[PDB]
Amino acid sequence: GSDTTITQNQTGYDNGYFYSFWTDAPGTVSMTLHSGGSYSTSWRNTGLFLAGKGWSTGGRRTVTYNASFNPSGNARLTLYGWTRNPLVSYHIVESWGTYRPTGTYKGTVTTDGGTYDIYETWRYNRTYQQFWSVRQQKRTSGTITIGNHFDAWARAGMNLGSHDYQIMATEGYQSSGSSTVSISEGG
């Protein structure tokens, strides 16, 4: 009597947190919205998807998360978000499945007990930049001092625009799996 499961692309507010769900393979992935900043996903022989909870306006907030992250194949556990003017997406990748994301290497940032590799890539069709911090070892719970990532990106010339949403996301490309992720502000 309460949690909600969704299967169609949408954004909204659930239990006081912003959420977003997107796939290009409807019918192969779902998201279940739990109390607070928590959700689960389940996917089976999927295409591309990204789902998560967080905030409709991102910023430098320190956040803490805990996750169960159960990919068969290619998936990521990521603090993900977007800006406009310029249009940029960014991913702070905490864990990954069979593939570890990479791009043009621009340095490292050491924050929250770990060292992350910094990368830049571009997406083509709008063409825009994607920024990455990818931890050098996987983890599935801890604190992300988001401002440290933003500052390290800026030192490398990777400049952000005005923030749109910011979520602790599960991302997948093919294969199958599940996750349960909880996020909140604070150290």
TrEMBL record:
GO terms for molecular function: endo-1,4-beta-xylanase activity; polysaccharide binding. Residues 176-186 have a biased composition (Low complexity). Pathway: Glycan degradation; xylan degradation. Belongs to the glycosyl hydrolase 11 (cellulase G) family. This is Endo-1,4-beta-xylanase. The chain holds residues 44 to 235 of 344 of the full protein. It comes from the Bacteria. One of its GO terms (biological process) is xylan catabolic process. It catalyses: Endohydrolysis of (1->4)-beta-D-xylosidic linkages in xylans. The active site is at S89 (nucleophile), E171 (proton donor). Its EC number is 3.2.1.8. Residues 5-184 form the GH11 domain. Keywords: Carbohydrate metabolism, Glycosidase, Hydrolase, Polysaccharide degradation, Signal, Xylan degradation.
